[PDB]
Design an enzyme around this catalytic site. Structure first.
Site, PDB file in Angstrom:
ATOM      1  N   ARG A 173       0.849  -1.185   0.000  1.00  0.00           N
ATOM      2  CA  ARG A 173       0.000   0.000   0.000  1.00  0.00           C
ATOM      3  C   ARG A 173       0.882   1.232   0.000  1.00  0.00           C
ATOM      4  O   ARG A 173       1.654   1.448   0.933  1.00  0.00           O
ATOM      5  CB  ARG A 173      -0.953   0.014   1.192  1.00  0.00           C
ATOM      6  CG  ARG A 173      -2.017   1.094   1.061  1.00  0.00           C
ATOM      7  CD  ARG A 173      -3.308   0.746   1.779  1.00  0.00           C
ATOM      8  NE  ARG A 173      -4.397   1.660   1.412  1.00  0.00           N
ATOM      9  CZ  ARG A 173      -4.965   2.560   2.216  1.00  0.00           C
ATOM     10  NH1 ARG A 173      -4.570   2.705   3.472  1.00  0.00           N
ATOM     11  NH2 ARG A 173      -5.951   3.325   1.761  1.00  0.00           N
ATOM     12  N   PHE A 226       2.174  10.818   0.938  1.00  0.00           N
ATOM     13  CA  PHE A 226       1.776  10.353   2.268  1.00  0.00           C
ATOM     14  C   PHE A 226       2.799   9.348   2.815  1.00  0.00           C
ATOM     15  O   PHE A 226       3.638   9.715   3.629  1.00  0.00           O
ATOM     16  CB  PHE A 226       0.337   9.807   2.244  1.00  0.00           C
ATOM     17  CG  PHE A 226      -0.130   9.202   3.547  1.00  0.00           C
ATOM     18  CD1 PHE A 226       0.363   9.626   4.781  1.00  0.00           C
ATOM     19  CD2 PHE A 226      -1.092   8.207   3.529  1.00  0.00           C
ATOM     20  CE1 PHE A 226      -0.084   9.045   5.963  1.00  0.00           C
ATOM     21  CE2 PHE A 226      -1.539   7.633   4.703  1.00  0.00           C
ATOM     22  CZ  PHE A 226      -1.038   8.055   5.919  1.00  0.00           C
ATOM     23  N   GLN A 230       3.770   1.691   2.714  1.00  0.00           N
ATOM     24  CA  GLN A 230       3.493   0.693   3.747  1.00  0.00           C
ATOM     25  C   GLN A 230       3.872  -0.714   3.300  1.00  0.00           C
ATOM     26  O   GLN A 230       3.619  -1.114   2.166  1.00  0.00           O
ATOM     27  CB  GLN A 230       2.018   0.733   4.133  1.00  0.00           C
ATOM     28  CG  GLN A 230       1.637  -0.213   5.265  1.00  0.00           C
ATOM     29  CD  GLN A 230       0.231   0.012   5.786  1.00  0.00           C
ATOM     30  OE1 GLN A 230      -0.326   1.098   5.660  1.00  0.00           O
ATOM     31  NE2 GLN A 230      -0.349  -1.024   6.379  1.00  0.00           N
ATOM     32  N   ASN A 258      -0.968  -0.032  12.121  1.00  0.00           N
ATOM     33  CA  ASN A 258      -1.776  -0.758  13.091  1.00  0.00           C
ATOM     34  C   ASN A 258      -3.246  -0.735  12.698  1.00  0.00           C
ATOM     35  O   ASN A 258      -3.619  -0.152  11.670  1.00  0.00           O
ATOM     36  CB  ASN A 258      -1.543  -0.220  14.517  1.00  0.00           C
ATOM     37  CG  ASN A 258      -2.033   1.203  14.706  1.00  0.00           C
ATOM     38  OD1 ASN A 258      -3.147   1.544  14.320  1.00  0.00           O
ATOM     39  ND2 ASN A 258      -1.203   2.039  15.319  1.00  0.00           N
ATOM     40  N   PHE A 290       5.372   1.691   8.036  1.00  0.00           N
ATOM     41  CA  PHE A 290       5.356   2.619   6.925  1.00  0.00           C
ATOM     42  C   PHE A 290       6.491   3.608   7.036  1.00  0.00           C
ATOM     43  O   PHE A 290       6.985   3.913   8.129  1.00  0.00           O
ATOM     44  CB  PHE A 290       3.993   3.320   6.750  1.00  0.00           C
ATOM     45  CG  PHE A 290       3.533   4.130   7.943  1.00  0.00           C
ATOM     46  CD1 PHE A 290       2.975   3.506   9.053  1.00  0.00           C
ATOM     47  CD2 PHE A 290       3.603   5.520   7.926  1.00  0.00           C
ATOM     48  CE1 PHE A 290       2.526   4.249  10.138  1.00  0.00           C
ATOM     49  CE2 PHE A 290       3.148   6.267   9.010  1.00  0.00           C
ATOM     50  CZ  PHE A 290       2.609   5.629  10.119  1.00  0.00           C
ATOM     51  N   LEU A 328      -0.982  11.500  12.794  1.00  0.00           N
ATOM     52  CA  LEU A 328      -0.699  10.154  13.280  1.00  0.00           C
ATOM     53  C   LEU A 328       0.008  10.151  14.640  1.00  0.00           C
ATOM     54  O   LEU A 328       0.147   9.089  15.251  1.00  0.00           O
ATOM     55  CB  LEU A 328       0.111   9.381  12.236  1.00  0.00           C
ATOM     56  CG  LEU A 328      -0.575   9.274  10.867  1.00  0.00           C
ATOM     57  CD1 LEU A 328       0.288   8.466   9.913  1.00  0.00           C
ATOM     58  CD2 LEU A 328      -1.966   8.668  10.982  1.00  0.00           C
ATOM     59  N   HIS A 355       0.250   6.134  16.112  1.00  0.00           N
ATOM     60  CA  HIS A 355       1.231   5.189  15.589  1.00  0.00           C
ATOM     61  C   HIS A 355       2.559   5.406  16.272  1.00  0.00           C
ATOM     62  O   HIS A 355       2.986   6.544  16.469  1.00  0.00           O
ATOM     63  CB  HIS A 355       1.373   5.355  14.081  1.00  0.00           C
ATOM     64  CG  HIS A 355       0.111   5.042  13.356  1.00  0.00           C
ATOM     65  ND1 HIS A 355      -0.122   3.821  12.766  1.00  0.00           N
ATOM     66  CD2 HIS A 355      -1.032   5.756  13.214  1.00  0.00           C
ATOM     67  CE1 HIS A 355      -1.338   3.815  12.247  1.00  0.00           C
ATOM     68  NE2 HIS A 355      -1.912   4.975  12.510  1.00  0.00           N
TER      69      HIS A 355
HETATM   70  N1  LIG Z   1      -7.188  -3.254   9.742  1.00  0.00           N
HETATM   71  C1  LIG Z   1      -7.348  -1.932  10.201  1.00  0.00           C
HETATM   72  C2  LIG Z   1      -6.451  -0.917   9.762  1.00  0.00           C
HETATM   73  C3  LIG Z   1      -6.601   0.403  10.210  1.00  0.00           C
HETATM   74  C4  LIG Z   1      -7.636   0.730  11.113  1.00  0.00           C
HETATM   75  S1  LIG Z   1      -7.850   2.382  11.686  1.00  0.00           S
HETATM   76  O1  LIG Z   1      -6.744   3.267  11.132  1.00  0.00           O
HETATM   77  O2  LIG Z   1      -7.831   2.392  13.206  1.00  0.00           O
HETATM   78  N2  LIG Z   1      -9.362   2.880  11.139  1.00  0.00           N
HETATM   79  C5  LIG Z   1      -9.563   2.899   9.739  1.00  0.00           C
HETATM   80  O3  LIG Z   1      -8.710   2.605   8.914  1.00  0.00           O
HETATM   81  C6  LIG Z   1     -10.937   3.320   9.319  1.00  0.00           C
HETATM   82  C7  LIG Z   1     -11.128   3.897   8.043  1.00  0.00           C
HETATM   83  C8  LIG Z   1     -12.418   4.287   7.641  1.00  0.00           C
HETATM   84  C9  LIG Z   1     -13.512   4.098   8.505  1.00  0.00           C
HETATM   85  C10 LIG Z   1     -13.326   3.517   9.772  1.00  0.00           C
HETATM   86  C11 LIG Z   1     -12.039   3.127  10.184  1.00  0.00           C
HETATM   87  C12 LIG Z   1      -8.533  -0.270  11.551  1.00  0.00           C
HETATM   88  C13 LIG Z   1      -8.391  -1.593  11.111  1.00  0.00           C
HETATM   89  N1  LIG Z   2      -0.156   3.634   7.688  1.00  0.00           N
HETATM   90  C1  LIG Z   2      -1.349   4.375   7.626  1.00  0.00           C
HETATM   91  C2  LIG Z   2      -1.692   5.287   8.665  1.00  0.00           C
HETATM   92  C3  LIG Z   2      -2.888   6.013   8.580  1.00  0.00           C
HETATM   93  C4  LIG Z   2      -3.755   5.834   7.480  1.00  0.00           C
HETATM   94  S1  LIG Z   2      -5.260   6.731   7.349  1.00  0.00           S
HETATM   95  O1  LIG Z   2      -5.470   7.578   8.596  1.00  0.00           O
HETATM   96  O2  LIG Z   2      -6.398   5.739   7.175  1.00  0.00           O
HETATM   97  N2  LIG Z   2      -5.090   7.602   5.917  1.00  0.00           N
HETATM   98  C5  LIG Z   2      -4.277   8.755   5.924  1.00  0.00           C
HETATM   99  O3  LIG Z   2      -3.697   9.166   6.914  1.00  0.00           O
HETATM  100  C6  LIG Z   2      -4.126   9.418   4.586  1.00  0.00           C
HETATM  101  C7  LIG Z   2      -3.493  10.676   4.490  1.00  0.00           C
HETATM  102  C8  LIG Z   2      -3.312  11.284   3.234  1.00  0.00           C
HETATM  103  C9  LIG Z   2      -3.745  10.634   2.064  1.00  0.00           C
HETATM  104  C10 LIG Z   2      -4.359   9.372   2.150  1.00  0.00           C
HETATM  105  C11 LIG Z   2      -4.543   8.762   3.403  1.00  0.00           C
HETATM  106  C12 LIG Z   2      -3.416   4.930   6.449  1.00  0.00           C
HETATM  107  C13 LIG Z   2      -2.222   4.202   6.516  1.00  0.00           C
END
Ligand SMILES: Nc1ccc(S(=O)(=O)NC(=O)c2ccccc2)cc1
Ligand SMILES: Nc1ccc(S(=O)(=O)NC(=O)c2ccccc2)cc1
Length: 164
Positions: A54, A59, A62, A101, A112, A121, A125
């Site tokens: 991903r 951004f 990952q 996570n 990531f 974050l 994180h």
């Molecule tokens: N597997 C997994 C990976 C990340 C996360 S999270 O970052 O705590 N929440 C969302 O990613 C999210 C996005 C849209 C709507 C509701 C929640 C939770 C589970």
């Molecule tokens: N590793 C990781 C940590 C957090 C998240 S997220 O909170 O569901 N999405 C963004 O933070 C974000 C920001 C800019 C553009 C697209 C996404 C996703 C992956």
């Protein structure tokens, strides 16, 4: 001192080069140790052969899901998941290495590398290192991402390990 580890990365079977990471074992010893051991493969499993699954331009990149290769898997050296150690280090800018996570206390093996400051974050994180060398490689990886996170090339950690 703090460990130095490396990831050698291919894109569609073409080597991109090496990312060298310093792990902040002085601040987050448990989180650093997990990543270090997954790089060496010394427990019998780890990152070698797995992918950046991903990648979102402007951004982060990952990786670390060496069991399911899609963001659902991975495991730590301690067990399937382990607690958030602390949130002392912040997502200060490009090159930050942080744990992916699924909510509080769900660290496994996914991680990531940031390509921008990701302040939202902080406190969510666990940051545990940073890029020492190879941001050019990270920028290549980043360029093969998309808004959805889908990669347009297969990005493989062909080799990884510990330098010191
Ligand atoms: N597997 C997994 C990976 C990340 C996360 S999270 O970052 O705590 N929440 C969302 O990613 C999210 C996005 C849209 C709507 C509701 C929640 C939770 C589970
Ligand atoms: N590793 C990781 C940590 C957090 C998240 S997220 O909170 O569901 N999405 C963004 O933070 C974000 C920001 C800019 C553009 C697209 C996404 C996703 C992956």
């Amino acid at each position: 001192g703090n460990p130095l580890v490396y990831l050698d990365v291919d894109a569609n079977g073409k080597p991109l080069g090496r990312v060298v990471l310093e792990l902040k074992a002085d601040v987050v010893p448990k989180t650093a140790e997990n990543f270090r051991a997954l790089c060496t493969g010394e427990k019998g499993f780890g990152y070698k052969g797995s992918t950046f699954h991903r990648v979102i331009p402007s951004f982060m990149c990952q990786a670390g899901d060496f069991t399911n290769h899609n963001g659902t898997g991975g495991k730590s050296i301690y067990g399937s998941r382990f607690p958030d150690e602390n949130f002392t280090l912040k997502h200060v800018g490009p090159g930050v290495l942080s744990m992916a996570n699924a909510g509080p206390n769900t660290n496994g093996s996914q991680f990531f590398i940031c390509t921008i400051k990701t302040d939202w974050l902080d406190g969510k994180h666990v940051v545990f290192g940073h890029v020492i060398e190879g941001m050019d490689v990270v920028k290549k990886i980043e360029s093969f991402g998309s808004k959805s996170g889908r990669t347009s090339k297969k990005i493989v950690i062909t080799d990884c390990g510990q330098l010191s």
